[PDB]
Amino acid sequence: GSSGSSGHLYYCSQCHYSSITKNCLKRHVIQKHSNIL
Ligand SMILES: [Zn+2]
């Protein structure tokens, strides 16, 4: 439960891909979903 992002999986915004350690997940979005501005 309530913890320092130890026991919690975050889901992707674009797709429904969730993986532990959201900290790293951030990359996926950029990789799998490389958007430009
Ligand atoms: Zn994704």
| 22 in Cβ contact with 10 (< 8 Å) | yes
Question: How far does the centroid of ligand 1 lie from the alpha carbon of residue 19, in Å?
Answer: 10
- Annotated binding-site residues for Zn(2+) read 12, 15, 28, 33
Decide: helix, strand or coil at residue 20.
strand
Output the CA torsion sign for 27, 31, 33, 37. Answer: positive
Question: How far does the centroid of ligand 1 lie from the alpha carbon of residue 35, in Å?
Answer: 12
Tokens of 37: 């501005």
Distance CA 37, CA 5 (A): 30
Question: How far does the centroid of ligand 1 lie from the alpha carbon of residue 26, in Å?
Answer: 9
Question: How far does the centroid of ligand 1 lie from the alpha carbon of residue 17, in Å?
Answer: 5
Structure obtained using: NMR
